[PDB]
Design a protein around this ligand. Sequence first.
Ligand SMILES: CCCCCCCCCCCCCCCC(=O)OC[C@H](COP(=O)(O)O)OC(=O)CCCCCCCCCCCCC
Ligand SMILES: CCCCCCCCCCCCCCCC(=O)OC[C@H](COP(=O)(O)O)OC(=O)CCCCCCCCCCCCC
Lengths: 542, 542
Amino acid sequence: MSQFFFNQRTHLVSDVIDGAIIASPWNNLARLESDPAIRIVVRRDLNKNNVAVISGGGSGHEPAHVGFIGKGMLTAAVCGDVFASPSVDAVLTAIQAVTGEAGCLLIVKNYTGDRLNFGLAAEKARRLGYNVEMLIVGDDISLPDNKHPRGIAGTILVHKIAGYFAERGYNLATVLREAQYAASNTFSLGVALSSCHLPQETDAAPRHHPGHAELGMGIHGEPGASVIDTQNSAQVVNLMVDKLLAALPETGRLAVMINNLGGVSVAEMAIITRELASSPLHSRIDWLIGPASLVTALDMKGFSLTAIVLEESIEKALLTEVETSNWPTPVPPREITCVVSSHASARVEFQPSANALVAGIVELVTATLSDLETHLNALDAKVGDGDTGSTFAAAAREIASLLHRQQLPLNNLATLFALIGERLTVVMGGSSGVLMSIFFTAAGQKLEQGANVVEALNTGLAQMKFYGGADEGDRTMIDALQPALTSLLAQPKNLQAAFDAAQAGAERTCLSSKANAESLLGNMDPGAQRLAMVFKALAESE
Amino acid sequence: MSQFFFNQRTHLVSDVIDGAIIASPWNNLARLESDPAIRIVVRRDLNKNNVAVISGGGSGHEPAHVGFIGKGMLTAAVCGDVFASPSVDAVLTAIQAVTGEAGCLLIVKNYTGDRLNFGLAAEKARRLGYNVEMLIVGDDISLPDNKHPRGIAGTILVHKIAGYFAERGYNLATVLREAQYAASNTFSLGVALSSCHLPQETDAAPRHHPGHAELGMGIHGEPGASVIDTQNSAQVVNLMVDKLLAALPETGRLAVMINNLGGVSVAEMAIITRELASSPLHSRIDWLIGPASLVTALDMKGFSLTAIVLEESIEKALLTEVETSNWPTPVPPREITCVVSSHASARVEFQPSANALVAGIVELVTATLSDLETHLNALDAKVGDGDTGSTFAAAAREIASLLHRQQLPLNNLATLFALIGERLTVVMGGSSGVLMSIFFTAAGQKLEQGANVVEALNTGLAQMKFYGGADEGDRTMIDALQPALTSLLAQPKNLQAAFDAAQAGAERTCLSSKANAESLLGNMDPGAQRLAMVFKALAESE
Ligand SMILES: CCCCCCCCCCCCCCCC(=O)OC[C@H](COP(=O)(O)O)OC(=O)CCCCCCCCCCCCC
Ligand SMILES: CCCCCCCCCCCCCCCC(=O)OC[C@H](COP(=O)(O)O)OC(=O)CCCCCCCCCCCCC
């Protein structure tokens, strides 16, 4: 039932911590020696002269909170087990470990377990002479009737402000004051299509509503505030924006954080970002934080939108650089500029011209392929889609038509090939059309460089092989074409030899035919056969 | 069926592009004016004097490739629909739009659709005089028997090297040479627990093998090379490391990229990072790229490991700063340092002392609670877990025992309270224990500041409320405690009044009792009742 990458369940959180450290951009993180049941990460920049800002809580919201430890933000983070509050002992240990006379501010997300455990910790700390303050963050607005708003993504915006002042030597009282001020100006709303996968065997797959979306699903998977009858990005985001606007002051600039709860695709997150930029909330946004996975719920497929009012010191504090593994640098929503380029008409130019010889070839090649439609479909039907005959016929007739309408530059092969190369893909769908267009386009160009027909045709083959990836023996027209083009390269005028070569190659494709679970002529590749018949026709006209 | 955030299916990719631009860190991205069916993103830093490096392919791998467009990397990216190759027209348009005499290098992931479409494009470009080169990247090693290795995450490492040389004015030939050299030294292997959710109605949920993992699942959800009978992070990573080692040179330094296909939790990604750091591959790693979502498969819950050999110019080129939305700065795997702190024994010190008065109170309070065990469980059983009586009895007896063993500092309330506060949570499990410990700890400290008992008890209540979050009327012991403590604050010695107050409060909890779907005494909160009986006992001893 467990769909989770992990090793020993009991070492889960510890392993996450090791990984976070191993990838530390600043290499400013360090575990704190302690009993295995205490999981504290602290910064190596320990400057007890400044006020310590400690945070934490149950794990499963990485990069929170370890990812926000460092200069300008969190001093330490107390990590509980997955979605489980840290022990009182653990919290105390962190306080004593990084708190100097300046004191420390505990930033706690609104959840009983954390409030009670960090709380008893603060109390035990105070008895030991430490100066402690606690700020409970409850930024969720999904449940108006809730006495205790849950603390979610916005919490880190609180870390940011608290960190600003703490690093700059302001006193505990000031840190708390400002931190509380930020909290009071932070509003978040989340939505999810499905809950998260837990690192354990469960009773039922993650909660999910088909075609719908649960507004307000908690970061621990808690029941949300409602269910939206659609997953449409615009509808979902605008609904969220309305509720955000109803909670925000009617005026003032805003910073908005687009947080990925863990399971939304980057593509989706981009679309969400676009919706937000087009929402009624748009004209008041001066900064975007994300889209990014900042405060997650394991792999929960949902996202959250956090709006913080930019009053007073808030904005100054948000924009200050810090040194953490995951703080994202705020960015003003950029406008979508549209660049214009100077592109020459791809369309190949030409002037109809006669040449009885060439016309005779074009007519012959053209007819042979056209006549083979049903036979080539039959061969293709064996394993393919039974349409190769029609695809090839489509191209033949297109060039035949142009021929019959005296529209071909028959007197100039280079331009003629270039013209066919341009027209085939338009009438021939699928890889066949593209490959043939590649063939003639490259051939037409080799001729433009003044090469003889056979040389150009071989270059066409060479290019068809490079892009197509096929080789002699893979059962495609190549198996008959190459032999023929090689035959002609030695005997430029011996059409009988060319045909014979192509014919042998086509025959080889009947052997290596896997699909066959007597004469085996029904296992012949249509491409090769078509090719062999073309040369056969050419050889019989000489 | 569709579990995807999007609006109009036909505008999906376009909306993703808009969002990518809106969030552009460098604001160096711009859409290219064109037919709606052509989706090209180009850099505003267009310097046609240098060789252009174009990429792209089907969408759903964000941030690739739009996220690697910029100085030092991609010049432009051609975006097809979700998991569908861009049109030939589209690719050409990009070439003509950003290519100067210096020419351009097309970097294509190994997939027919892309090879054929970028291919015909290159051919049509060459006829127009542009100098073009194409490098097909096939870094996947999951399918040894495959003639055409799929191109996955490693592709961007190729963009990095190509970009290095192109920005520095080297010629096309050199760009291609180096780009090919990087490719040849790039090896990737992916694994997934489930395929991705598509932006459409489907026949069945994403492919998934319960308890197992599909090794080599493609970035388009293509069938992998095998199925691992476990999801264990260590086993899975070591298996992958073996195969990587079998493909890598037996010696040489390495850069390893840990890519999140889109649906793995950040926690999981950290654990994976730890496994890699402990794998036999460990001693040859000088740089880590990620964990991060770099080349995704929508929300596919899997990850990939790419190893690139650091020979010649590779390392120099990897470490150069570039200007893109998502290139991650490589980091040396940090070692996990363990810090030591100086923490004073939390354990409260005391010396047994007598005091008949206090002892009489402790005995009385202690007994009353103990006697009420079964009755309080009965009340708690109504809606709670029916254990409050036992939890409270557990604490009572613990303090009674200490009392009976002449172990209490009876002559010093401050230390006595501090001692009880320390011992309750140890014997009382759950929030009840923590709350009571909070109460006494804070009370003991208020006394230490030289306050009278009633004042200290009120501070205890105040702290219990702050952390506990409960208020008068929420149906907890507070409903009886507060009234009593307030009564005593006015009449310090009138125990009868205190009891009566507590009793009224306990009675109030019988009314607001929701659970009841006569006398209503069975709807009384255990906490409140326990509290009322304590005071009743005190009042009856005077
Ligand atoms: C899928 C639909 C494709 C539709 C293709 C239509 C166009 C067919 C190709 C027209 C070729 C015109 C060749 C012009 C004749 C020529 O080059 O004469 C010069 C040379 C030497 O002089 P001589 O002819 O007077 O003795 O002629 C030759 O060397 C003979 C070689 C002829 C090779 C023909 C190959 C045709 C392409 C086969 C493609 C098959 C695709 C299924
Ligand atoms: C369900 C949990 C209920 C918790 C109730 C706590 C009840 C405390 C009872 C205190 C009686 C009220 C004080 C009366 C005024 C007074 O002054 O009494 C005289 C004396 C000295 O006061 P002074 O120094 O200010 O002049 O007060 C005392 O001696 C207080 C003795 C406290 C004994 C506490 C026993 C605690 C047992 C905890 C068991 C926990 C089980 C979960």
